[PDB]
Amino acid sequence: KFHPWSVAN
Amino acid sequence: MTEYKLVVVGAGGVGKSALTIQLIQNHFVDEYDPTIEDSYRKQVVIDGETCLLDILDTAGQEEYSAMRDQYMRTGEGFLCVFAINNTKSFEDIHQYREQIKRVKDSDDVPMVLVGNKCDLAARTVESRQAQDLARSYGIPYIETSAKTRQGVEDAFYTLVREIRQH
Amino acid sequence: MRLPSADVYRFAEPDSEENIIFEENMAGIPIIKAGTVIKLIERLTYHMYADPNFVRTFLTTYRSFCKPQELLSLIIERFEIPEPAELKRFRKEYIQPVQLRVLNVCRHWVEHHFYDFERDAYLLQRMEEFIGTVRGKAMKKWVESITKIIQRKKIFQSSPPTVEWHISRPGHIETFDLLTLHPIEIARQLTLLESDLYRAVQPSELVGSVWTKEDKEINSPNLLKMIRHTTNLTLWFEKCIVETENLEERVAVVSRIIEILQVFQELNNFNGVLEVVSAMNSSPVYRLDHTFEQIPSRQKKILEEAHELSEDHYKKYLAKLRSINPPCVPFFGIYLTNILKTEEGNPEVLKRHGKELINFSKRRKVAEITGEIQQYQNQPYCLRVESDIKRFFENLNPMGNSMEKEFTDYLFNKSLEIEPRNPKPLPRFPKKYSYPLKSPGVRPSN
Ligand SMILES: [Cl-]
Ligand SMILES: [Cl-]
Ligand SMILES: [Cl-]
Questions:
Q1: Spans of all domains in chain B
Q2: What are the two backbone dihedrals, phi and then psi, of residue A2, each rounded to the nearest 5 degrees?
Q3: Which of B3, B96, C191, C387 is within CB 3.0–4.6 Å of B52 for a Cys-Cys bond?
């Protein structure tokens, strides 16, 4: 979630 | 209060920027400073519910064609805008929409077709034609006048209703 | 002091609400908001003081409300002053300074906007005739200076870092590629190219929104060439990714591009940064979840910082740029949009007491934007050109002969092939690279 280069929560 | 990320899409060189500029101006204000937040964010009341319209219009950057996906990825609703005196801008609509569908990975993206009467130049796209294209896509058609602001609010509020009813 | 009658000299009629408005809520000089063209010519050659900023703004933006032939006629008409002791002061405090100002306008015109004269030879003739008829002594030094300029127009500190090489050896043109050249040097050579492309764009290609109109290819050739370069690199990055069908190799490709981005950031090449960000936001690349999975978190954060520059209408890009000092390469798109909306969102003319007044402050607003563009064109990068890497990127042609739609459809279909939509399982593909995929990194060698 929140773009593929984002820290996944 | 809810915020709506809207994106204006359409051919360049035929005055598409008038649609958003007129929405945001105070109807009797003719100044526009595009460099400040208040030039693309407007608080409005639509069907009794207050919301905030955030409007991305990249008019002038049409040659940066590899940037369209980036810009489109930021919206949840889309205004697809052509000029009713420019047949080519009307024919471009089909591809713009295929591209929005692909960016959003969805076959019903909230969107709206907008015919803009931007000139004293003569109409070459008949309203019937645009109404028929809008029906084949399953979306509203709105005509607007750059001169008079007729239709401008209708185009944007309709897009918001499409998002609410999605 | 006393002037001629507006029936013999039109620039003597006095200011009024039907003549000149000033900005009400903003170097000692009043800011003209609007006025007739006469009044604008008058204050452009004002006898009480010189106004360098009005002259700069004016000559950059006048062609929308006044043709070059008309401007030259008007300043000639301003120059030829008729007379009304009293005369002796008039000569010294009106004719003299007013005429010096006319010559100053001509000097600046020929110096910084000579393209008006290259595109109309008869305009240059009338100018030379006029300058020829000027016969004074306070004039002589100005007449000669303008004539020198006209005649001419009719014709680092420290050392730069060592050039970096990776797998390809100097001169082995045939092996140059994304993974075989050194990432630091890709970024550097692309920054040199993009800096020169940015520096070549003239205000004549921007004022009047002229790059959006049907003669754009004639009027904005450098701007368009610059944009097409940017577009080309974006598409080249997308193609390198989706044509690398092996997953491990594709992770190496995406990872190397992100290293190129980091150096772009280090160099303040924001055009470079956006080339990469646009490529990662594109439909073929953005959906490759199995590839970003293997991207190390440190590079993810680099790409995340870069992409965030573009969010909320470039909020962070705009702050970051205001805070760096040259050399840099700004992203030009923001300027184009702001110039366009300024020209399209403000009236060309204001009406006062039924009288029509040219809206000048809208032109001031556009000159402010072209001024900010020029301030980043001054300073060059302290980096050495590599003739061959440069030519490699000058000749990148990812689209080949395909049309836009056909080619971006092909990129997307490649994406779907190499990582199909979630139900279908992830296939495997054979490696395509013979050399090692490990990166030299982005810190230099010494
Ligand atoms: Cl409105
Ligand atoms: Cl505004
Ligand atoms: Cl149809």
A1: 2-164
A2: 80, 35
A3: B3
Tell whether C81 and C200 lie within a shared domain.
no
- Distance CA(B87)–CA(B115), nearest Å, equals 11
Q: C122 with C182, same domain?
A: no
Of B54, B53, B61, which is closest to residue B10 (Cα–Cα)? B61
* A8: contact with C, CB 8 A cutoff: no
Interchain contact, B63 vs C287, CB within 8 Å = no
Q: C134 and C165: one domain?
A: no
What is the residue range of C318's domain?
161-332+376-445
A4 touches C: beta carbon within 8 Å: yes
The tokens for C131 are: 């300058």
Q: How many domains does chain C divide into? A: 2
Does the B2-164 domain belong in CATH 3.40.718.10? no
Contact C344 B95 (CB under 8 A): no
Is the domain of C59 the same as that of C98? Answer: yes
Domain termination residue (choose one: C359, C375, C391): C375
The candidate with the shortest Cα–Cα distance to B84, out of B48, B47, B130, is B130
CB contact under 8 A, C278 and B69: yes
Q: Are the beta carbons of A5 and C288 separated by less than 8 Å?
A: no
Cα B117 to averaged position of ligand 3 atoms, centre (Å): 21
The residues in C 210-269 lying below 8 A from B, measured between CB atoms, are 211-214, 224, 227-228, 230-231, 234-235, 238
Answer yes or no: do C284 and C311 share one domain.
yes
DSSP C269: B
In one-letter notation, the amino acid at residue C99 is Q
HEC letters along chain B: CEEEEEEEEECCCCCCCHHHHHHHCCCCCCCCCCCCHHHCEEEEEECCEEEEEEEEECCCCCCCHHHHHHHHCCCCEEEEEEECCCHHHHHHHHHHHHHHHHHHCCCCCCEEEEEEECCCCCCCCCHHHHHHHHHHHCCCEEEEECCCCCCHHHHHHHHHHHHHCC
